[PDB]
Design an enzyme around this catalytic site. Sequence first.
Site, PDB file in Angstrom:
ATOM      1  N   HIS A 101     -22.398 -59.779  -3.203  1.00 35.26           N
ATOM      2  CA  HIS A 101     -21.893 -61.013  -3.023  1.00 35.26           C
ATOM      3  C   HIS A 101     -20.865 -61.803  -2.442  1.00 35.26           C
ATOM      4  O   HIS A 101     -19.977 -60.815  -1.662  1.00 35.26           O
ATOM      5  CB  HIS A 101     -20.833 -61.724  -4.839  1.00 35.26           C
ATOM      6  N   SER A 106     -19.521 -55.509  -4.283  1.00 34.55           N
ATOM      7  CA  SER A 106     -18.569 -55.960  -2.963  1.00 34.55           C
ATOM      8  C   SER A 106     -18.903 -55.328  -1.453  1.00 34.55           C
ATOM      9  O   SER A 106     -19.546 -55.672  -1.152  1.00 34.55           O
ATOM     10  CB  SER A 106     -16.995 -56.391  -3.154  1.00 34.55           C
TER      11      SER A 106
END
EC number: 3.4.21.92
Lengths: 100, 187, 190, 192, 190, 190, 192, 190
Positions: D113, D88
Site C-alpha cells: 500500500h 508495507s
Amino acid sequence: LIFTSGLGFSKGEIIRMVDLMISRVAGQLKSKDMALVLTDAAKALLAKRGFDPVLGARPLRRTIQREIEDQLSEKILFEEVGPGQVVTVDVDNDAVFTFT
Amino acid sequence: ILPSFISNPYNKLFEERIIFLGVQVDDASANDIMAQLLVLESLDPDRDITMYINSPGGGFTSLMAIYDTMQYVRADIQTVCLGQAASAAAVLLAAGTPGKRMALPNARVLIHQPSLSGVIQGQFSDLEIQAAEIERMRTLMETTLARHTGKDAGVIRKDTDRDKILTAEEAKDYGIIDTVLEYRKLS
Amino acid sequence: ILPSFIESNPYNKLFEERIIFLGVQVDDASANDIMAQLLVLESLDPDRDITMYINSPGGGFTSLMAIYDTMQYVRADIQTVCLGQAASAAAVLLAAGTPGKRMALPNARVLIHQPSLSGVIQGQFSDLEIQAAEIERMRTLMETTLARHTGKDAGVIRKDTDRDKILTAEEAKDYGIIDTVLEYRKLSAQ
Amino acid sequence: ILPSFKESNPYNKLFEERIIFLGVQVDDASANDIMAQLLVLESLDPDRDITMYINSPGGGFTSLMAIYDTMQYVRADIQTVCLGQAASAAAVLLAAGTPGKRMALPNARVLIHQPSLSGVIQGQFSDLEIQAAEIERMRTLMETTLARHTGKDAGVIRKDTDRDKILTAEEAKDYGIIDTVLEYRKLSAQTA
Amino acid sequence: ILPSFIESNPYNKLFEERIIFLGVQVDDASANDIMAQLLVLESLDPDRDITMYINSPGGGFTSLMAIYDTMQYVRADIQTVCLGQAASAAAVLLAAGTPGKRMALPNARVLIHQPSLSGVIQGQFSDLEIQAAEIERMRTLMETTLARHTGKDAGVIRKDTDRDKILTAEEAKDYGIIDTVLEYRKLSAQ
Amino acid sequence: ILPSFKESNPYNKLFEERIIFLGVQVDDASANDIMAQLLVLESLDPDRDITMYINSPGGGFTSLMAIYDTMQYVRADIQTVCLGQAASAAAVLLAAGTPGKRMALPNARVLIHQPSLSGVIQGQFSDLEIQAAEIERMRTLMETTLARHTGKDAGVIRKDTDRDKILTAEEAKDYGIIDTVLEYRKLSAQ
Amino acid sequence: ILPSFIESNPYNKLFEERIIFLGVQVDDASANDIMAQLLVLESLDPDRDITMYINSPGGGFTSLMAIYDTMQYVRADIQTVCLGQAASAAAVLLAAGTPGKRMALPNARVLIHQPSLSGVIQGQFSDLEIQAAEIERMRTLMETTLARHTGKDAGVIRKDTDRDKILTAEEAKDYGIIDTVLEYRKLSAQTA
Amino acid sequence: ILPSFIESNPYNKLFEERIIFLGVQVDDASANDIMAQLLVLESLDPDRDITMYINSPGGGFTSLMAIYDTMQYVRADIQTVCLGQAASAAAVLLAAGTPGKRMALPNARVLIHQPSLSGVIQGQFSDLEIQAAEIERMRTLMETTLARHTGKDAGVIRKDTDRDKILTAEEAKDYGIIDTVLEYRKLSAQ
C-alpha cells in the site's frame, strides 16, 4: 654472610664524601704538578647536583666527572692552566663553576 | 551503541588520564569525577590529569565538590571544552591549571548567576535564610571566577547579571581559557 | 536483537576497520561517544582514514559543533557515507568529510534547514533578546560551515535553507554536499 | 525465554549460516543492525548468498531505503523468505531479493500500500507544500522500486497500491513479488 | 524466581531434549523465537521428533501462521502437548502436531473460537470493505486448517466456532484436536 | 537483596536439594517454571521426594490445573509444606501432595473459597451464557479435586466453600487438606 | 552503589558468616528470600547460630508468620540484632530469636501495635463478618506470640498494643523484646 | 558511565583503601549498605581507620541512627570528610567521626536543622499525641547526639537548629562539627 635489600584526602658528611671522591682527581693533578682546591660553595653545589637521596651517592662520581674532570681537561689542553699552578674551583650564580 | 575493542573507548581514555564530564553536574556525576580524580592522583601524582567538559551545568554544591577535588589533588589538571560549558561547567573550565585550559574553536561558554528552579515555600523567617544562602552562593561563584580569570568580583558580577555567551576566543580574552585548539589534520 | 559471533558483534567489527556509526539523534551522549571513538581511532593509526556512516535525523547544535570540531581536528581524514538520510545537523557532518571522500547511497536523502527552537523559552524581554542574538549566531555559524564545505556562499546557503530543502543523492552531489553517489557492487547485476 | 545450547542462541546459529532475521518493525535501529549484518556477512564470504527472513509489519521509508540500498549493494546475492507476513515496507524488501531467490511460505501474507503519514505536521502553507512534495516523491520512488523488481509498470503499481492490497503467497507469485512458494519437507507427510 | 546458575536454566535442559515451550502469547517475538528453535532442532537432528508444550491463551493470526508453516515445513515430526490451556491460536498449534503425537493432560482445556478484532479499525468505507474481506479470508483459513487437522468439514468447524467452544481433554480427543490423554505415571500410585 | 556464593543463590542450592518454592501468585509465568522444575527433578532422580514450599496467595485456574497435572504426573513423590498461607488455588496444590506427605507449619493458614471472576466479562447474553457454564465447570472441577484429595464429598466441599473458609493448620489437618503439622526441629528447645 | 571487592559483596561476605539481613518491608518476596537463606544455612551447618539483622518498618502478617515459623523450625539457633528500627511485624521477629540471644543497638527503636487493615475490603455483610473474625484471630495470635516471647500475659500485650507503642532499646529490654542492649566496642573510646 | 581499569572501577579501589562513600540520601538501602561495608572493613583489619566521604542532602532519622550506631560500634576509628555538603542527618554523621578525624573541604557546606515531618500524618487525636511525642523524642535525641559530639550544650543546639543553619567549613570547625579544613595539596603553585 652478609645480605642486603594514601588514596585521597589524607592530611589532617656529604662534603666529606665529595672530598673523598675528588681526592682521586686531586692526586692525579698532583702527579701532574697541580694542586686542586674546592671552595665550600663549590662542594655544596657539587653535592646538591650529584647526590640523590633516593639513590644515595651513586650519581656523585659521574657528576664530578661532568663538572670538573671535563672542564679541567679542556682547560689543561688549552694551556690556560700550567704545571705548578694552583687550580681553584669556585661557583657563581642555575649556577656555574669557574676555574682560576 | 558504543563499540568495545581489544575495552570501551572510555576505559581507553581513562587509562590515558582523561576524565569525561559529559553529563549534567549533580551528585552522581560529582562523585564519579571525585573517585576518578583520586584514583588517577594515586596512580601517578606527577603526571597531569586531563578533563573534557561537554556539560550543560548543574547544581552548585556538586560543582563545589568537583572544584575542591580538582584543586586539592597533587596532579595538574588540564581542562578542554569540546562543545559547551554552561553555568557550573564554566567555573570548572576556568578551574583548570593556568596555561592548561583550552577549548575547541567552535566551543561555547555560558556564564550566568545562580538561579533557583522552582519555588521554595515557607514562612518569611525561612525565606530570609534561603535568600541569604542564595546570595552567599552567588558571591562564592563571583569570587571563584574572579580568582581564576583575573577579574574583579564586581566586573564578573556585572557580566553575569544576565546570561553571557562567549565563543572560544571571547572566553580566552575573558580569562576562562588559555588556548584555542588549532586543528591537527595533516591536510 | 543483534546476533554476535566468534564474541564480536557487527558494530565492534566495523569499529575494528575504523567505521563510526552515527545512526541516532545527535545529542550529548552520541557526541561524546563519537569523540571518544574518533580519538581512539586517531591514536591507533593517525595516517589511516576514518569512515563515518550517517543515518541520523539530526539534533542538537552544540553536539553538532563538538563532533564537527573533533572530526576536523583528528589527524586522520574522515570519509562520510550517508545511508538512508542525513537531515538537519547530520547533513553538516556529512558535508564536513574530507573533500573527495563524501559519499551517499543512490536512494539516500539529505535535508538542510535553518536551526529551529524546540519548545518555548519564557522570560523577560532582555533574556529573550539575548537568546535571539544567540540563535542568530548559531544560524550564521551553520551557514558559514556549510558555505565553507560546499563551496557556495553564505548568502546562497541562507536563502536555500529558509525552508526545508530536501535533496536526493545526485542533487546533493550537484549542491556540493557530497562528491560521489555510490554504485552497486552486485555481480548478478553486472 | 529463548534457550541457549561453545554456547550459542538460535539467532547466533542462524547468523553463522548467513541468515538475517528482519522480524521487527523497520526503523533506524533495525535498519542499522541489518546493514551491519549485511556488510559483515558480505566481507566474510562475498560470493555466498545472504538469506533474509521477513516477518515484519512495515516501518519507515528512509530505513527501508537504507536496507534496500545495502541489499542491492553487497557483492553477495540476497535470498528473501517471507515467514508470516510482509507488510508495507517489508513487501518492498521481499521484492528486492535476487530474482529467482525470493520465496514465501504457503500461508504467508504480503501487504502493499502507498505511504501513509503517521500523525500530522502543522505549519505554514509554504512548509506544507514542501512536505507534500516530499511525500509524493517518496510515493513515486516506492512505485518505481516495486515496478523495477516486479516487472510491472509504475502506473499499474500506483493503481494497485492506492488502497491496501493483501496478497497470498500464490497471488504474490503471480503479481511478481516472489518467485517460489515454499514446499513442506516433512518426511512423514511425503510418505503418505 | 527460576533456579539457575552460571546457565543450567531448566528451559535449557528442556531444549537440549528437543522441547520447545510455548507458554506465552502468540505474537511476533515469541513466534520468531519458536521458528528459530524449530529450525535449529531440525538441523541438529532432522529425524528426531521435536516436542512442543502449549500453555498459551493464543494471539495474533499471522504469528500463528508463521509458527504453523514452520512446524509443517521442518523434516522432524512435531509432538504437541497441551498442558494448562490451549486457547484460540494455540488450539490450532495443538491440532497441527503430527497425527498420533498430539496429547493433553487430563485437566487441560482447549478453546476454539473464530477470529476477532483487537480494537476498531477506522477509515473510509472502502478501506473497511478491504479489511472485512481480509478478516473473512482469515476466518475461512482457520476453518480450513482445523478441518484439515481434525477430519471435519469446514462447515462444521464454522458452525461450532461461531461462539466460544471449550473442550476438556476427552472432548478434544473426540473432536479430533488431540489423540491421547496422558495418564499419570506416579509410581507410588500403583 | 539476595546473597550469592559457579555462582549460586539459595534458591538454586535448594533446587539441587530437590526443593521447589511456590511463593508467588500462581499464573502462567510461575506455572511454566514450576513445571520445568518438576520435570527436571523427576528426570534427575525419580525415586526421591520433591519438597514444594507453598506460600502463595492464589492465582488462576488453568495455571493451577497445569501445576496439579504435573504434580500428579511425575514419578517422584511430592511433599507439600505450607509456611505462611495457601489461599484459594494454592490450597488445592497443598492437598495435591502425596498422601502422608502434606504438612503445614503450626501458624500456617489455608483459605478455600469458590472461584471468582474479578472484573466484568461483557458481551451478548449468548456469550455470558457460555462464560457462566465454563465458570460452573471450573468450580465443579475444583470441588471434585478437593473431594478426591480430602476424602469428603463434592457436596460438602461445595457447601463449605460457598464463602471464604479460613482454616488453621490443625483445622486443615482435621479437614483432610494436610496430614501432619510440622513440629519444630530446633535442638535448643528439645 | 555497593562496592564489590576481591570477589564478593558485603552481603555475600556476611552470608558466609551466617548473617541474614532483613532490611526491607516484610512481604512475600522478602519472606521467601529469608526462608531460603535460613534453610540453606541450616543445611550447611545445623549446629551453628544464625544471625539476623532487623532494620525494617514491618509488613504483612502472613509473611511475618512464615518467617516466624521458619525461624522456630530450623535447627540452628537464631540471634536477632535490631539496628535502626523494628516496627510492627519486625518487632515480633525481633522477639522470636532464641532467648538470651536478642540484641539491639543503643539507639534502636521498637514499634509494636495491633494489626491494621490499610485499604478497604468491600463485600456483603456475610463476607465482612468472616473477614472481621479472621482479623480478630490474627490480632489474638500476635498477642499470644508476644506474650510467649516476652513473658507477659496476653491481656497485658493487648492493652499495651491498643495504640502504637514505641520503646527505646532499654525500654525494650525492660519489656522483654530483647535481652541485652549492645555496647560500643570501639577501642579508642575504651582506651580514653 | 564509570570507566574501569586494570580489573576494577573507582569505587572498588576506594573501598580497597578502606573508604566508604555516602553520596546519596540517607535511607534504609544506603544505611544497610554502609553498615555492611563498615562491618566488612572492621573484620578485615580492626586497627586501621575507616574513611567516610559524605556528600548527601540528609534523609531519614532511623537510618541515621543505624549508621551512627554502627560507626560508633565498630572497633576501628572512623574518619569523616565532607565534600560538597552535609545536610541534616549527614551532618550528624559528619560530627560523629572520631574526635580529631572530622574534616571538610574548604568550599563544603554543613546544614543542620531540626527534624521535620515530611507529608501529613492523619488519625485520631489519641494517635497524633503519640506521634508528636515520638517526634519530640527524636528531636531531643538529635540535639543530644550533636551536643555530645560538638561539645556544645543541648539547649544551645536546640536554639540554633530551630531554623536551617548553614555553616561553611570554618564556621563548622568553630561550631565543633569538624576539626580541620582540608588544605589543597597541589604541587604546582604550592
